């Protein structure tokens, strides 16, 4: 079950309210394996508290580490269905324009589809 299915909307809103009050310089981020992704491993945790200065480049690196991936293994972190425009972009800016109605910033990771026929 995804994060949104394990915690209700009101519950999520409340989660964010508290965390933002306790850590005003951190961004509450939900990072999960894309529902369509089956090759990449799953994380033991899905809720992250990220300093707002952290950029996409650094975020991509730590999650890769968390998933114990080799540099040459395909990995992509998508926000609202799209890749990160710039990797130098601070998570604070991503939060500003991409956050969910519940206050969380959602992200899903995936590798690539494989192909073959008949």
């Amino acid at each position: 079950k995804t994060f949104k299915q394990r915690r209700s909307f009101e519950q999520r809103v409340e989660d964010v309210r508290l965390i933002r009050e306790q850590h005003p310089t951190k961004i509450p981020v939900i990072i999960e394996r894309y529902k369509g992704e089956k090759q990449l491993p799953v994380l033991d945790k899905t809720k992250f508290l990220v300093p707002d200065h952290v950029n996409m480049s650094e975020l991509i690196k730590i999650i890769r580490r968390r998933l114990q991936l080799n540099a040459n293994q395909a990995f992509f972190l998508l926000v609202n269905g799209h890749s990160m425009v710039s990797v130098s972009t601070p998570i604070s800016e991503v939060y500003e324009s991409e956050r969910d109605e519940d206050g969380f910033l959602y992200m899903v990771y995936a590798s690539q589809e494989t192909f073959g026929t008949a």
């Binding site: 269905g81 799209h82 494989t114 192909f115």
Partner: protein, 315 residues
């Protein structure tokens, strides 16, 4: 003599739309109206690799055919082959069924023949793939075949290529220059694996994608429709043009090369059907070519309503 016959000129194009839209093929622009011969020649010249049957068992006891599972491996072979063609023969080179071809041509083709000894054969690819965690007979994605080809290229001292696979949507110019000046510049094969969406490609990337086929360095794109990989070599209007490996042919027995050339107007599919998992490739023969490519990329900021698929950074 020939005057008493109807040569059925352009018979092959009865399967192509006559539009004013230019046809782009790996960095070359053509006019459907006055260049059907040129279009067909360029497409037919590309090395085409399809499923094969009755070749030596992979690993001694493995498959003797790759029908049904080798599709992305075949697309990888085709885009890498095009890089070799450019490196050894040149983008201007064209193949002709009659005329004797250059010896370098047979060397390039030979490297993809279905035999263990060939640098980039299905045998070498599948076997090297195991080290990447891919069992023999397992379907590949774009990055995997690209990674396998990079490792195989190491042994190709004849081509002595520098293969850079840019991960994380980022192309680091410093790393590339360092790679090409190592062991003064090794021709560069740049592969960029991307995921332009979850199930579909965002319309925002469409124009940027089209422009990836409009550069002199364009090697095309590998990816496909769900359950059907293709080697995309260009586009016309809103349709991508490609070579399809999903045809099983008998392993070649000598080298007779007609089966490695798709002598037909290319297959087409709407850009809207392209799955988001792809790998875009570029070939930069010299440092000047790379510098020009970098300029080509930056200039894309002039695309109206488009978004970049990747970014160029210094380090």
């Amino acid at each position: 003599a020939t005057l008493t016959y109807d040569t059925l000129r352009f018979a092959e194009f009865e399967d192509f739309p006559e539009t004013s839209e230019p046809v782009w093929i790996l960095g070359r622009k053509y006019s459907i109206f006055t260049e059907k011969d040129e279009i067909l020649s360029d497409v037919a010249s590309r090395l085409w690799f399809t499923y094969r049957k009755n070749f030596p068992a992979i690993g001694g006891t493995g498959p003797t055919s790759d029908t049904g599972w080798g599709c992305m491996l075949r697309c990888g072979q085709m885009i890498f082959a095009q890089a070799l063609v450019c490196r050894h023969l040149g983008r201007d080179w064209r193949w002709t069924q009659r005329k004797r071809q250059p010896d370098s041509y047979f060397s390039v083709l030979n490297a993809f023949i279905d035999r263990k000894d060939s640098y980039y054969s299905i045998h070498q690819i599948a076997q090297m793939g195991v080290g990447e965690g891919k069992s023999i007979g397992q379907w590949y994605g774009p990055n995997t075949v690209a990674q396998v080809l990079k490792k195989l290229a190491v042994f190709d001292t004849w081509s002595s290529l520098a293969v850079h696979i840019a991960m994380d949507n980022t192309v680091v110019m410093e790393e590339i220059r360092r790679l090409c000046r190592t062991s003064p510049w090794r021709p560069l094969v740049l592969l960029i694996p991307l995921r332009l969406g979850l199930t579909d490609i965002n319309e925002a990337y469409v124009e940027t994608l089209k422009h990836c086929f409009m550069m002199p360095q364009s090697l095309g794109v590998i990816g496909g429709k769900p359950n059907s990989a293709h080697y995309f070599i260009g586009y016309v209007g809103e349709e991508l043009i490609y070579l399809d490996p999903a045809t099983t042919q008998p392993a070649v027995e000598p080298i007779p090369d007609e089966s490695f050339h798709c002598q037909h107007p290319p297959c087409r599919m709407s850009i809207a059907e392209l799955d988001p998992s792809i790998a875009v490739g570029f070939f930069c023969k010299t440092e000047d070519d790379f510098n020009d490519w970098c300029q080509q990329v930056k200039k894309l900021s002039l695309l109206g309503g488009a978004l970049p698929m990747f970014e160029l950074v210094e380090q």
